Design a protein around this nucleic acid. Sequence first.
DNA 1: AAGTACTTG
RNA 2: AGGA
DNA 3: CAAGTACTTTTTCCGG
Lengths: 171, 178, 84, 557, 107, 97, 271, 112
Amino acid sequence: MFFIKDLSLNITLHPSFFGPRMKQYLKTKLLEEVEGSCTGKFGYILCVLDYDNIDIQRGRILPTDGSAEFNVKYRAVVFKPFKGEVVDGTVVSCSQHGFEVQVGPMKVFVTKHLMPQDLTFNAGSNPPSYQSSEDVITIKSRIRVKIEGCISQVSSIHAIGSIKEDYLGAI
Amino acid sequence: VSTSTFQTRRRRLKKVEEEENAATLQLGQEFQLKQINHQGEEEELIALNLSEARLVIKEALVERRRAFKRSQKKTREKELESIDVLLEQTTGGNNKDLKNTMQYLTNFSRFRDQETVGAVIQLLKSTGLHPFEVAQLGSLACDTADEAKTLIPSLNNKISDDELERILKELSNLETLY
Amino acid sequence: KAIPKDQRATTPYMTKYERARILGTRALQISMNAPVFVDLEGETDPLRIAMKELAEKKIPLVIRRYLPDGSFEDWSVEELIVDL
Amino acid sequence: GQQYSSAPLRTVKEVQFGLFSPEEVRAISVAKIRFPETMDETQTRAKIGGLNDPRLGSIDRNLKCQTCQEGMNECPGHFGHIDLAKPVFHVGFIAKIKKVCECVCMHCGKLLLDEHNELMRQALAIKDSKKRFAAIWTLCKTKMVCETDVPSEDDPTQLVSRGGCGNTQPTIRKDGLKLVGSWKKDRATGDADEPELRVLSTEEILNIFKHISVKDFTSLGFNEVFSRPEWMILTCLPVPPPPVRPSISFNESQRGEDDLTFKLADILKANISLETLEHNGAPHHAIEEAESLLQFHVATYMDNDIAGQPQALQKSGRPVKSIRARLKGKEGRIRGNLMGKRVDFSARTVISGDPNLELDQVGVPKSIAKTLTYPEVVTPYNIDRLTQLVRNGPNEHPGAKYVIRDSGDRIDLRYSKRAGDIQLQYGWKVERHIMDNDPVLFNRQPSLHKMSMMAHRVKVIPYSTFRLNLSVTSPYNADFDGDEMNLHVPQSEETRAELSQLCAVPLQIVSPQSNKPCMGIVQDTLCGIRKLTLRDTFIELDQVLNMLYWVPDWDGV
Amino acid sequence: IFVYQNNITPSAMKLVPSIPPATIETFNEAALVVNITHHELVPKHIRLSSDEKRELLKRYRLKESQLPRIQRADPVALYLGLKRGEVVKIIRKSETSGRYASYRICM
Amino acid sequence: LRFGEMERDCMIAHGAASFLKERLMEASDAFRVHICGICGLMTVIAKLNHNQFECKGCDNKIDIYQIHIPYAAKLLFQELMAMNITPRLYTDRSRDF
Amino acid sequence: RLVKALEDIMVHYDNTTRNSLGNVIQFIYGEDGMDAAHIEKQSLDTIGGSDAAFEKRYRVDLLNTDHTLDPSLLESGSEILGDLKLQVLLDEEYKQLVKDRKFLREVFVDGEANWPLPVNIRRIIQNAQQTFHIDHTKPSDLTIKDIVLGVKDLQENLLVLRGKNEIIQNAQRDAVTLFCCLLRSRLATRRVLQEYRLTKQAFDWVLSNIEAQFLRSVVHPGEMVGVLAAQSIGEPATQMTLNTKKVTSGVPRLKEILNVAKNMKTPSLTV
Amino acid sequence: EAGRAALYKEVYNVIASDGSYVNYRHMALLVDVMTTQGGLTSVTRHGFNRSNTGALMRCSFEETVEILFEAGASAELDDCRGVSENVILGQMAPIGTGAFDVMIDEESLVKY
DNA sequence: AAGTACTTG
RNA sequence: AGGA
DNA sequence: CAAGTACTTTTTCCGG
Ligand SMILES: Nc1ncnc2c1ncn2[C@@H]1O[C@H](COP(=O)(O)CP(=O)(O)OP(=O)(O)O)[C@@H](O)[C@H]1O
Ligand SMILES: [Mg+2]
Ligand SMILES: [Zn+2]
Ligand SMILES: [Zn+2]
Ligand SMILES: [Zn+2]
């Protein structure tokens, strides 16, 4: 998982910033946009690497307004979750439907039907828990889950997982 | 505006196939083992493991603070509080993604140091496996070569049960304490 | 994909067209409260400032001259001559 | 003006032409377009789920578009569609459809001639997509039989089979909208004497065109992705949205629907006639009859100015205004709306000449400079001055008409309860009056010259004429006998530069046309300069002293 | 080269393409009476070898199409025995420069 | 007033590239359409108060751009499509030449 | 019609005249590469006159006692006499001037001497005279090597196409040919000395002025010659109408030409 | 090449008929424009407008719609290299002032 | 209509 | 219908 | 190979 992808944003600078602290604003405006971003195309963009060596290139001045468009060629750390990818995470929430698990930037939810039978909901616990013949999953519990599917949403790739299969479940 | 990559494919009119993505090593149209870095040159995919990843970000976020105080001139629970501070100095804080990620890594990391992570990277990157398989072995710990060949189904025939067992053995030996 | 500064063949002198666009562009910038690269010796008009900026050859602009085939030669206002 | 869109801005680098795929038309369509009823959902004024806004664009102006909530300006219009009861030829390709038949087999859909004929493999070698389809056609038009066996590229003794299909090919000729062929025949070796005269149906030609090989049609004019032959024959009709066919609604309860809105309703009507006719008790002749009518409507919608007479005149005597007609040159989309345009920031008045103006200056009346506006940006090197123009208002000459904030909201200095107390901010625009020494484009139609349009320095004067210098009469050609002239006002500090730096009158002094000056001294001066420069001419001290003062750049000597 | 008095029958004319790499040409005796080339209006036309042509295209940053053209049937093309794709360098006098060199590709 | 075809001529003769564009666009027509990147058509159902884009038919939601063109072109284009012709507009290249 | 046919034609940054496609119409705009305003109908002295007149104006013979330049013209006038090494240059000069005359008689077959060429050399020298205050009594501070060579080397800098290769370099030579015939005609030693009576500085200034003024006189890539030409023919046509052997001429003939009409009104042979 | 001569020789004699003067380079260009194609290319809707330039470019004169019909049908691609093609797209045409591009250079910018 | 282009006799 |  | 049929613009801008 977690990749190092080479990307490029096209930023348009108002001529008001045509001072020497321009490369500085441009580099800053990149991380304003790109860092903390989330596309289905590349996944969660988490960190722009090598701040010092980010390339600015020559900026084209735009025909009828002063603004100049630069193509910022850069490199960053991404996280694009896939189906079939087995991921370790910590539980967040727990309902009579299943339980959500935080995995790095994103949350993966496991239905009651995506867990075994033995493991069954218990409303009567602070906080709510899924109790098994040998185990118990509550709120802060450590779990290894298999992503069954991904739903590429707004500014968050959410997913659905399984702990029913062999070698999955609590850890 | 939005971010784009080096993959220049000119998909004129012809929309589809939108072929799915599984750990049957069928990754993206962005994540091919053959992906050209901006220098123009062909490069391989860079897949990081939890710890290989923590040490990449921790690194870039340190050198960012190194350039921020330059231009401004004119133990797990203990590393978690340490990192949560470095984010406040370098990142916009609005990047709640990186905050969780750094905690997730700091907790789920298999190897504490860039020397131990170095060693892991040798052992694995010899097998001749796709970087996604290689990362998933160093990312999460197994026991039966079956635990691995089942969680990383992409392997299966890719290696000897015995070989993977020897690698898995030497991985748990490199496993840095917490 | 470009031409190296040593293999350049285009007029070493600025064309009437380039001049009018560099002057226009700097004026359009100066007006949009852009940073003025010279001492405005009591100057108030951005085109008069852009003329001064160009006379002192203190304009930060580069003219990408495209050849018919596609490739181009990159030239600076500083490196161009002005007989116009 | 038009509100901020998060989309990345770009410029059109390529225009890839093609044909609409009946499958594409259906996808991209925000509605069909089931009713010839314009709207008036049971007479109750609003729109119907049939023609105009069955999810389309929007009328009412007070009704936000029912798809993209945008509405009116900002919203384009959303395309529609109508499934045609039977296929119909597109008026334009009518003869290319014919020419394609003249090239292919009317049964198997394979080229009548191929790589085995020498002249063919040679005509196939033409690189051009048109010149090659030109040769291919002339060659194949004469081949009246689909060949089963052809003598090999060696001997006349070994006749090897290419494509099969024996079939005797027709002799296609148009009958105005309709294609009718005449099959050679055979009866007792000869025949014709009396052949076979059957009309080729849109529906069959459609099917034949479907069967034409990619490699095949690709060697003819066509392309596999953008323009397949099968797309010259219409199955799905794109229904243009309101901004193309506007409802010019005079007063309240009075429709005002566009001509194309009628021709579409006419096509709708004609389709519902044919659809019911064939689903129900088919009187056969009455179908092939109501068919030909729908093929006609679709024709005269796109092109009403056809050979086969009927100009499908709108009941008022006046013919129906085709889409072809809409775009056809000198006025009409291309020549008159795109290549040439009616423009804002323009002035025209009677011209008179002044001998006390500089060559490069143009006298502009007080009204004309108070009318015309320049967008000055609140910069520190004017802030104070611009505030006084704003204080001056839009009725004093050196004044301003509007103040446009960063917030893109227009302040009308002419009314606005604040035109007195209005404190300007940097980055704002003050739409100020045209002032002395601003550049302008003075023009005199015809304009058969680079010199028939020149940049002049404004000089705001009294009296309702455009006063220009006399030595600049010769290039415009204009005299002062009831002569009128145009004047355009630049908007960009970049455009001002454009004018002053390349267009200016002193620049146009030496004409490239004839490598000689195009302006000179004329009339009063030309005659007086002869009079002044003879040996007989002598001037008294009194006058010399005045004449010397008259030269602006006199030394004092 | 074949010099024919009045005509060459369609029968014989079929044999012109028959023997490549060798090439055959037909010139009517009556056309050859006067030399066109010698005329006031006709300038110097010069054949370009593959080497020269490739260089001309490299130097002017061209495509074979982008070059001005000469017909294969052009009186001068026939005279010099131009083949399709061959380039001619045209040297005319000039009231502007003195000498001007143009190039025409054969189609 | 009319900035006629004839008047566009001499503007081109002058070299006044920007001023001619400015005349045709800013002092007239000047529209902002949203075009799809797959099929270069004005099929974009740009709900720009919500930054939702989309060109159904192309299934798109990502490859969409904005363009500034005369309202008459926007029209001509719609008029051409109304007649089964596709003027697909692309903000990229392919031929190079 | 013209305007529509020619719109897309302009001079690019390679000084080549091309269209929408980029196909070459002309390799150098107007066979010379000069802007049309910068030209003046100058006179080629070398072309006309008697073969004897020619000799009297251009021939310098340091070997002949009566064909040397008298020491009233230059200072070296006494010590210059006989020098075989120098007479190589004045023989070199006179032989190139001869070549020119024979070449100009090749171009202008009628012998017309008045041709439009950039840089008014007459006016450069005229204006040099009042600038430096030329005394047509005192002798010049030039050497034969100063005049002969200075000219040779000004010719090097008269750049139109810039490229370094035989195609472009041999094409530069072509686009510049005629102006040099004029430059050599007006800057030959005997002319400079007897007629112009130029000093050293005066001459050195003349050269740098011709050079700089020439470099100005060239066309600006971007120059829209399609529309220019179309208008420079289209406007004159309109003034044959707004005013008023026997062959069809003017507005109707021009129509036949542009249309490339097969059936002319007055087909006429001239033998 | 002799046809070019006869072309200018005639074109020029039409202008010089009135007495008026036009600089070689203009008629020479037009004559050279007609000529280049390979033979005499009439300044008519069935000569130059029938050549292979732009589509929108060609359409802006005489066969407007008719040209556009063949455009869609043979799937013509537009260069947008032509003057007219940009005028129709509201793009700064690649002529005179727009025949090159302007860029800021952070190097020269921080130097001043 | 003038001029040409096209296919048809 | 009119104007240069 | 011959007429015959088929086709397109014809200056620019500016009040019932
Ligand atoms: N139909 C037209 N199209 C274009 N320009 C026209 C025109 N009619 C007239 N003009 C212009 O207007 C002028 C002629 O107007 P007229 O009524 O004839 C007075 P005039 O004949 O010019 O006085 P003159 O005898 O001193 O020449 C010309 O300069 C011409 O360019
Ligand atoms: Mg008049
Ligand atoms: Zn809408
Ligand atoms: Zn068949
Ligand atoms: Zn689309």
